[PDB]
Amino acid sequence: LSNTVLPSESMKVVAESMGIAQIQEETCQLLTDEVSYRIKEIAQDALKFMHMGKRQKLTTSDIDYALKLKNVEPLYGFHAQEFIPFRFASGGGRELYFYEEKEVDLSDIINTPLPRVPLDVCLKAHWLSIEGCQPAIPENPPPHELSVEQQLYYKEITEACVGSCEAKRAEALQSIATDPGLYQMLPRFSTFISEGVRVNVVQNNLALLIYLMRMVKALMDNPTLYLEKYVHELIPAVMTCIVSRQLCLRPDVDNHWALRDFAARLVAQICKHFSTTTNNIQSRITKTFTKSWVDEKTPWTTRYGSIAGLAELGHDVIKTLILPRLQQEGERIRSVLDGPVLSNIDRIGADHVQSLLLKHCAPVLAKLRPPPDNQDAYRAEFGSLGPLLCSQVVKARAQAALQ
Amino acid sequence: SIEGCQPAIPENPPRLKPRSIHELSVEQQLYYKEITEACVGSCEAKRAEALQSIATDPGLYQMLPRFSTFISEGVRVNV
Amino acid sequence: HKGPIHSLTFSPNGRFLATGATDGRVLLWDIGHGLMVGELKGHTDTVCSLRFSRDGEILASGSMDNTVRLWDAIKAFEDLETATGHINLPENSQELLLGTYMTKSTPVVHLHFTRRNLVLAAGAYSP
Amino acid sequence: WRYGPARLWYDMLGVPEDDLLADENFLMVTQLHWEDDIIWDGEPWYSIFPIDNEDLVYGRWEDNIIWDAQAMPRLLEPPVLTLDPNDENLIL
Amino acid sequence: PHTYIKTPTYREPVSDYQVLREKAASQRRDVERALTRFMAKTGETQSLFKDDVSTFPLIAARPFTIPYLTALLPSEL
Known about the structure:
This is part of a larger assembly, with 2 copies of chain A, 1 copy of chain C, 1 copy of chain D and 1 copy of chain E. In chain A, α9 (231-243) packs antiparallel against α10 and α12 runs parallel beside α15 (348-367). Chain A is elongated, with a radius of gyration of 41 Å. Helix content of chain A is 53%, strand content 1%. Chain A has a domain at 8-70: Histone, subunit A, CATH 1.10.20. By secondary structure, chain A is mostly helical. Chain A has a two-stranded antiparallel ribbon. The radius of gyration of chain C is 14 Å and the shape is globular. Chain D is extended, with a radius of gyration of 21 Å. Chains A and D meet through α5, α7, α9, α11 and α13 of A and α1, α2, α3, α5 and α6 of D. Chain D: This is Transcription initiation factor TFIID subunit 1. Chain D: Belongs to the TAF1 family.
């Protein structure tokens, strides 16, 4: 960024090797911008012998070729095999570094073992590429912690539920559902499932999400392991499979709809088995579903997920949550019976929402109405929910006849 | 005030890591044990006080899940 | 360039000229109009060797990266026949590069095409 | 942890690391049928531990879920496992 | 005491060496039984008895191309 020079306090030290007692700070600044200017002119001319003589190393014979170029006398004794040693001297207030040179008896250089004789430069030919890729000749480049038992069991069970074949998956899920000692591997499975449902945002894979939801459904059926301590991780994973909007890679043909009602049945089971008044699981799940449904701007997929979960919770929930907003069906049929914009995806999701709504509101209409139901459909929104309610009353009569 | 703290009497208005500490205190847990063992009616004066204690303890919230669960579970295995 | 030029070559028809410097970059120039008509940005170290083909088909470039890359001396030079001073160059060094051809710890000091288009080189094998 | 649980997802990722809205409607009594609840001698074990799990009780799990895939407050992250001991009766 | 009393006590830990040995032993036996039944069910299987896959399934013996590498080499080191 800036012009970097040798420090001005390094020239007071040098001036006292000379014998100059007091040197003023404007003289020391005058010395160090000249000697750091001549260092940069031999740093960059040594680099011209490193580049033209192709070396990329900057040996000490490059600087000696550049001092020879600037007419300045050479520096003797820098071609021997040495390195960078420095020796700290603490002292009583004078901090410095020196060399600590060593000695050697003269007869131990006359009687040193001689190195081996060098070889002369010769040539060698070899193919580098033969009409294509390189040959494989040797002149070329070559190209708390789970025990091992349960580590292997975790590896095999998790890789059996990634989708190589269906039979190994069914045996892995029947292992997870029916083994007695799978504790100490429950936190690993919860982490695997929650992170795998998170990895849907990078790759919208419907199939791997169906596999992870069948992994959760198999974990719930195990009688021996208690998921009370780990349910705070599995609740938002199933919630993500319910109320997210893109569950598909190709939105139009992928049946994200089933991973919706499967995960809705799953979360109704997870708040039937685990909701306690200290937990407030079910009230906090209904509140998220409710403020996702009543709030406008929500896509038809996430509204489908909200209605699916709320309708799998039970009968009184659809009495006191779904039935006030039945007028919203009119806002739905605004975009179904009517509209030039027909070739969008907002029609298949809307009539899926419609079909789920009238399927779940038909027994609720069968519970809280008269037995006749003559023009209840006309009194209902769009006159279709009422036809579905008549069909539901007929189905109930058929069930009574079967009984 | 008792050395700075206002009592809740009816004359007043209102990888290794450490184990978790129960929100309910051991005085509160001992109180729950005494009230439930008095409310199963071995002695009638004990019951009647325990019933009045339930009827007017202001701090009997945050113990109420354990009382409701003790009632509910009791009737079902007591029928 | 952004470094000292260490290699030069001429296209065999005479229209073009390619350089190479310590930034690891090959810049193609047009001699008739002094405009940089290309930029080949594959290398890593100093491109110390440059050579076109014998008819001008490909451009070969060896460096201190221990590579011999073969570029395309036809796809980059399709302006053969403006009054503005610019050519609006995109970045296209995936449809120009053809090979990489790493060598075993040896830079490529020289590059040569024979009378038949056969690449030669020169090693100075330094382990 | 790259080699920790959920490693297969990390390997695929290639990551370099390592008034109806009122609570009264959602009250359990409104959503629960009492007669169905009664066993009536027809054939429990909930929150047996004195302290309920803090993470479920105080955790903002609703915030973690994203309603819209297109808009996310937090972009995809390594999300390395805490590896923090939890539960009771663990051997170590 | 209820008026103004609070006992911030900890949770009694299990120091019973007998039940800790029993828990670790039974969990190791159960996870190795689950692992071997899963691996014998999802592969080629043998049987000591005629048509015996549910009870005592054996993983079938596969030949190695180089058997000393899987025999002599240590796996935990």
